[PDB]
Symmetry: D2
Subunit: 213 residues, 4 copies
C-alpha cells in the first residue's frame, strides 16, 4: 500500500499502510443480521441511514509533511493517533512554507504578490538564523525554537479510521477552511477514494457536508 501526493511547496501526504477495504465495512455490518451488487448496496444503505460504525473497521496510516499552522488545525481531530517530529529533541531543518504569488490573487495587495512572498522569505530566514545562533550558543533546542514561525514544516504519522476520515473531510474539504488545509484534505480524500471506492462514492452522495470534493 503506497501513495504520495505533494502539497504546497515542500509538503506531502503519503499513505504508509491500510487495514481493510470496502468489504471490511460490509463484513462488520453483516454480523448484525447474523454478492457484489448487494454488498455495494449495503454500503450505500449504511451511509444513507447514518450508520457509520461499520466504517470504523477500515483504518489508514498516513505520513504527512505540513506547516505547523496546518498541523495544529489537523491535530484538533481527537479520534486518531499521532506521532510528530520534536522540536525539543531534534535540530529543526530550514524548511518553511513560502506561499506562491498566485496564492494572493483576488486580494488586491498594495505591494505586488512577488514582494509579499519575498517579505515572508526574509522574515523566515532571519528567524531561522537566530534559532541557529541560539543553538550554537548552547541554548537548549526547546527554547531556541520558540522564535521559529508557524510556517515551519513538521512531519507526523497519523492513524485514523474511515469514519473519522469522513468527519475530518466534512470539516476540512470545504471552501470555509483555509486554502492550505483544503489542499491537504483533497490529498487525504484522493487516497481514501483509491483504497475504498465504494465507501468514498457513497460518502460523497449521501454524507459529505462540504463543497469541494
Amino acid at each position: 500500500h503506497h501513495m504520495k501526493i505533494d502539497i504546497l511547496d515542500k509538503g506531502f501526504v503519503e499513505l504508509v499502510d491500510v487495514m481493510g477495504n470496502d468489504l471490511s465495512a460490509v463484513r462488520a455490518a453483516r454480523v448484525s443480521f447474523d454478492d457484489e451488487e448487494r454488498d455495494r448496496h449495503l454500503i450505500e444503505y449504511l451511509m444513507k441511514h447514518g450508520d457509520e460504525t461499520p466504517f470504523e473497521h477500515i483504518v489508514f496510516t498516513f505520513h504527512v509533511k505540513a506547516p505547523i499552522f496546518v498541523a495544529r488545525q489537523w491535530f484538533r481531530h481527537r479520534i486518531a493517533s499521532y506521532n510528530e517530529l520534536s522540536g525539543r529533541y531534534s535540530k529543526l531543518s530550514y524548511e518553511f512554507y513560502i506561499p506562491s504569488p498566485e496564492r494572493l490573487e483576488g486580494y488586491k495587495t498594495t505591494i505586488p504578490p512577488e514582494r509579499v512572498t519575498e517579505k515572508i522569505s526574509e522574515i523566515v530566514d532571519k528567524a531561522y538564523r537566530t534559532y541557529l545562533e541560539l543553538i550554537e550558543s548552547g541554548v537548549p533546542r526547546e527554547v531556541a525554537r520558540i522564535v521559529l514561525p508557524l510556517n515551519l514544516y513538521t512531519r507526523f504519522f497519523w492513524t485514523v479510521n474511515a469514519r473519522s476520515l469522513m468527519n475530518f473531510l466534512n470539516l476540512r474539504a470545504d471552501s470555509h477552511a483555509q486554502w492550505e488545509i483544503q489542499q491537504y484534505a483533497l490529498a487525504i480524500a484522493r487516497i481514501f477514494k483509491e483504497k475504498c471506492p465504494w465507501t468514498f462514492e457513497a460518502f460523497l452522495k449521501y454524507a459529505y457536508k462540504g463543497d469541494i470534493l
Copy 2:
C-alpha cells in the same frame, strides 16, 4: 485465520491486522527526525511509558462470547464494535454452560454437576418460552428479553495495540471474572504472535496483571 476456542462454544478469531512491531518503530522515529536497534527502541518506549507509537498497530477480532462477558468487554471505549442484533435476528440456541470444574475451590451444598444441570434447565425453559413468543407474533426485540445472560453473542472488535495492552492489564488478571480471563488469554496469544517484541516488552516493563506472567502465551 487464527481461531482459538474458548469456553464450551466461544472463540476468538483474528480477522485482520495492520502493521507489526516495526510500525511502532517507524512512528516513534519521526520524533528524532537495524534489528537490535529497533527492538531496543520498543523496550525503551515501554520502559519509559511512551505508549503512543503502539497506537499505529491495529487488530480486528471476531469474537463469540456470552453476553455477560461481552457487556464487560464493551466497557472498553477506545475501540470499535459491531455486534449481532437480537432486535434484527432470531437468536440461536447457544448458551454457556459452566463445566463442573468451574465450581471448585468453592464449598457448595449440591454437587457441581447439579449446578451445571440447574443452569441447563433454566436455559432450556427460557429458550422454549422465547420460541413460543416468536411463534405467537411477539416481535423479536421483546421476545428476547427472557433469554439469560449466558446467551452467546458475536461481534467484531477493532482495537489498536495500546488499547489492547490496557485491555490485557484489566482482563488478563485474576480479579477479572474467570470467563473473560479466558478470552483475554486468547487475545494475548494472538497479540504475541503478530507483535512479539511489543508483547515481550509489554510483559517485562508495563503489564500490570498477574496471569500472563504465570501462564504461557
Copy 3:
C-alpha cells in the same frame, strides 16, 4: 430534584450539571465574563453551521435505572463515562421489566397480550428462583447470575457532555430505536431542555436527526 419514572420500575434522575446555555457561548468566544438576543443568536449560528465543540463545555451526570437489554444499547455510546452498580461498593437488588399488554397491542399475536405478560413473568420468576437457590448453595454470584434474564434492571451513573447527549438523542429519540430506549431518551431530552433551553431549541431546529422530539412536547 428531577427524577422521571420510565417503564415499570425504571427511572432517569439528574445528579448534577455543569454549566448552562451560556457555557457554550463563553467557550465559543473564549471569554470568562450577557446579552440574551446576541447569545441566543450565537447558539443558533453554532448549531446551524455544525460547530458543536462549544456544547462540549456543558456536562450532565444522570443516574439511570434500566433493564440490561436497554443498558447494552446505551453503553454503546462511547463518548461518555459510566459506572454501573456492581456488588462491590453497594447492595444489589433484583427486579425485572415485564412489558405491559399495551406494549404488544398493534401486533397481531395468536395469544392475548395478557398471556404474553404472564409467560414473561413466569420465566422471570423461575430464573430468579434458580439464581437464589444457587446463591444459597455456595455458588459465587458472578456464576449464579448468568441464568438471569436480559430484562433484569441495572443502575448506572452516566456523565456526558451536551454534544454527545445530542448525538445520543439523534439515535435514540427516534422511532427506529427500540421503544424502551425511546422512553429513556424522551426523559433525557426533557431534562436537557430544562437546563439548556436555548441549545435544545436550536438542536431541534437545525441539527436533530430523529422524528419523535418534533412530535412530542418535551
Copy 4:
C-alpha cells in the same frame, strides 16, 4: 481562582462539576455522612487503579499560553478544547519572552540576558512584518504564518479528573518542557483546592511524576 504563569500567561478556573463525593457517589451508584469511610473508598479506588469514578468530576479552565505550549497540551485527546478564534472574538498579539533565569544551568556562549534580547528582537520584527502584510491587504490567515511559536493563544479546556490526573502524570514531571510544567503545577493547585481527598490519594498512590512531591 486564577494563577499567572510565565510573563503574560495564566490558568483560571471557569467552572467545576462535583467534588470528592461525586466520585464516591458514582462508585456506589447512589444519589443518596461519614468522612472516614468516604475517604477510605477514595484511597481504595486510587490504589487499585479503579479510576472510572473520577470521570464524574469535571473542570473547565481558561488558559493563556504560548502556541508551543498549547501544541503539547492539545495532544491530550480526552478533553474538549475551544481556542481563540477571530470569528467569535477579538485577537490580541503578545509573546512569551523567557526570563534570563530560564537558561540557568546552561553554559551559553552569550549571556542569558542577551538570549532574551535576541528572542524579543525576532518577535518584534516578525510582528512588524505581520502588520505590514495586513496593511498591504494580505489576508490575516496568510499574514499570521510569519508569527513565532511563542505567540500567546487562549483556550477553554474541559476535562474530567481522571484525564486531568493523566495530564499531571505526563506534564507535572521534569521530563516535560519547563514551560508546560509551570502550567501543570497551576492545574494541580486548582485540582487540589477542589478535590483535596482525590488529589491526596493521587499523590500517594497513582501519580507517576516527580515535581508535585518536591
